[PDB]
Amino acid sequence: SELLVNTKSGKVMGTRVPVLSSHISAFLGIPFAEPPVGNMRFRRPEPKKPWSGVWNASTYPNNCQQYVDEQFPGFSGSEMWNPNREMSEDCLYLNIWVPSPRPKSTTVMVWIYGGGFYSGSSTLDVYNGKYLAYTEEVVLVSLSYRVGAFGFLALHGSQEAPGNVGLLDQRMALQWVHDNIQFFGGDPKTVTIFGESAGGASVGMHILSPGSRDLFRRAILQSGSPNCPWASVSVAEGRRRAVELGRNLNCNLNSDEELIHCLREKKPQELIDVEWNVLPFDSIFRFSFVPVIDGEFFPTSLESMLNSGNFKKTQILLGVNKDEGSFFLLYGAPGFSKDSESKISREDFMSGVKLSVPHANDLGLDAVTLQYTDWMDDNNGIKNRDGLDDIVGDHNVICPLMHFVNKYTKFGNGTYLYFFNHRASNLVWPEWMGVIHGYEIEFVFGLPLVKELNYTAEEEALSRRIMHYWATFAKTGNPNEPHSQESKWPLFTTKEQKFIDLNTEPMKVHQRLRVQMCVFWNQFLPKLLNAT
């Protein structure tokens, strides 16, 4: 039967689901590892041991333990991102959507959810993989990885809490895909890992980590990059935070063994409630437990690896949104409300840069300020708001991604760059927030194809070509369909630096994406802060 599959470790029984007046197979909650519970909390993932009988894969699994957001209870805009299942430490599962007539050996795309390495679920409505699996005829997989302290507490030197175990969870599901996707009609030599935000950084980190390299063919990064200021810490900082988490819990701090034995006894929520307490400064777009440059998952520093071409050389498709930082300013900066135009005053502008570039001396702060202020009209609330928005988006997403794209292209085999600037007609967030962090996702997954969601006809078309670019890239390594009458998305080269706009207007090609500001962030400020 189409729904019953003999995987290496056991039988899996999926379920038939409707998709736009049709059907496709869905295998939900398939486990790829032993439950990281008990004395396993904080440790490297272990492979799921074989089971007898048939594993019921007709329902989504649990979401991993995480800080649930409660800023706007009941508001769909914020809660669509929260865990929609029971949060359990037993959460290492992956889901697969296989087109009906099971494909013989087709393209595979593995989705890696993002959420600052502190949150995220594979089960959210926006990650329903049926539309893309059905429409583009690909085997769509969404995996899951431990987040926060569970997946990232790093006491470098300890084999109980080495750090980067969340990244290792991802690697294991990728291995699982490599060892079993062939039984679902997937081609393990043609898999594309794609993710957004922490999911976008994770993808880049797999392109850098030797132990992950041969588990996938190509890569797609959305609004995320391995070198993002928030995507990783030094092993020192990692250890520091691990000890501070333990201090915050009255933990015996004698040795790593004792700190870990303590933390392992606390109930999950106990760790979450103190999670943000370990950060260095009051900030936005900064998360407590994230990947550590250990010299194992990451042989050396990310920049050293980038300069030496010590990474997987394949094709990559990647991009950013127009207003990546508004989501964060709304939550942590003064003057920002979802119920108002949020015209920011000079006073709150200052307060906001301080929160956005937490690790910058006053000379730094002045530079960022001078760089984004119109001193001819510095009391303009609209400009101050948009100025600060750009600051958070440029510093945390766009420039880090642009630095990575320029480094990678030197050694890569094909790079395609996009700029998502479409504001959805049915957006629930206020207009000032613009094209929000995470909002190209519903288009990558094809939610506009379902009528009852109210997207315009032009939004259905945008989604369809975005999904086609993604699937065609995953299939061939070039998002453009051979000999088509459509507009060409050109290769991004270190010389021409071309990229395109992803929106309703007829495609347009641009060059040097936000160079001016990114020379500032990627070149000047680092040098200014280095000279101290």
Binding site for its own copies (CB under 8 A): 363, 366-367, 370, 374-376, 511-512, 515-516, 519-520, 523-524, 527-528, 531-532
- Return the number of the residue (56 or 379) whose C-beta is nearest ligand NAG: 56
The answer to whether residue 246 forms part of the interface with ligand CFQ (CB under 6 A) is no
Q: Which does 413 bind (CB under 5 to 8 A by kind): ligand NAG, ligand CFQ, its own copies, none?
A: ligand NAG
Residue 432 CB contacts under 8 Å (≥ 6 apart), including other chains: 326, 341, 342, 385
261 flagged as catalytic:
no
Cβ proximity to its own copies, 258 vs 347, nearer residue: 347
60 touches which of ligand NAG, ligand CFQ, its own copies, none (CB within 5 to 8 A by kind)? Answer: none
CA 524 to CA 367: how far, in whole Å?
A: 9
β-pairing, 316-321 vs 415-420, is: parallel
Question: Which tokens hold the place of 293?
Answer: 């440059």
3-state secondary structure of 395: helix
Enumerate residues 93-122 that contact ligand NAG by CB under 6 A: none
Judge whether 437 counts as a catalytic residue: yes
Q: Is residue 197 close enough to count as binding ligand CFQ by CB under 6 A?
A: yes
Catalytic residue among 119, 158, 197, 232: 197
Position 327 contacts ligand CFQ (CB under 6 A): yes
The three-state secondary structure class of 469 is helix
- Residue 197 is a catalytic residue: yes
Among 35, 229, 276, 299, binds ligand CFQ (CB under 6 A): 276
Residue-wise over 279-318: b if at least 16 C-beta within 10 A, else e?
eeeebbbbbbbbbbbbeebbbeebeebbeeeebbebbbbb
d(CA 326, CA 346): 17
Residue with smaller CB distance to ligand CFQ, 276 or 411 = 276
Q: Which does 225 bind (CB under 5 to 8 A by kind): ligand CFQ, its own copies, ligand NAG, none?
A: none
Per-residue 3-state assignment (H helix, E strand, C coil) for 32-93: CECCCCHHHCCCCCCECCCCCCEEECECCCCECCCCCCCCCCCCHHHHCCCCCCCECCCCCE
Closer to ligand CFQ by CB, 120 or 185: give it: 120
Catalytic residue among 206, 403, 422, 437: 437
Q: Could you tell which of its own copies, ligand NAG, ligand CFQ, none binds residue 56, using a CB distance below 5 to 8 A set by kind?
A: ligand NAG
Q: Could you give the string, one character per residue 408-437, with x where binding to ligand NAG holds by CB under 6 A and - elsewhere?
A: -----xx-----------------------
Catalytic residue among 136, 196, 324, 442: 324
The CB-of-491 to ligand NAG minimum distance in angstroms stands at: 6
Rule CB under 6 A: choose which of 332, 334, 364, 490 binds ligand CFQ.
332
Non-local (6+) Cβ contacts of 487 within 8 A are 506, 507
Q: Which residue has the tokens 């043609």?
A: 190
Q: How far is the CB of 361 from ligand CFQ (least distance, A)?
A: 21
Nearer to ligand CFQ, 112 or 215 (CB): 112
Unique residue bearing structure tokens 């300020």: 369
Enter the tokens of residue 226: 């391995």
Q: From its phi and psi, is residue 433 left (phi > 0), alpha (psi between -120 and 50) or beta?
A: alpha
Radius of gyration from C-alpha coordinates of the chain: 22
Site residues (CB under 6 A) for ligand NAG, limited to 55-94: 56, 58-59
Is 223 within 8 Å of 319 (Cβ atoms)? yes
At 329, is the secondary structure helix, strand, or coil?
A: helix
Binding of residue 352 to ligand NAG (CB under 6 A): no
Residues that bind ligand NAG (CB under 6 A): 56, 58-59, 413-414, 491
Catalytic residue numbers read 197, 324, 437
Which residues bind to ligand CFQ, rule: CB under 6 A? 69, 78, 81, 114-116, 119-120, 196-197, 276, 284-286, 327-328, 331-332, 437-438, 441
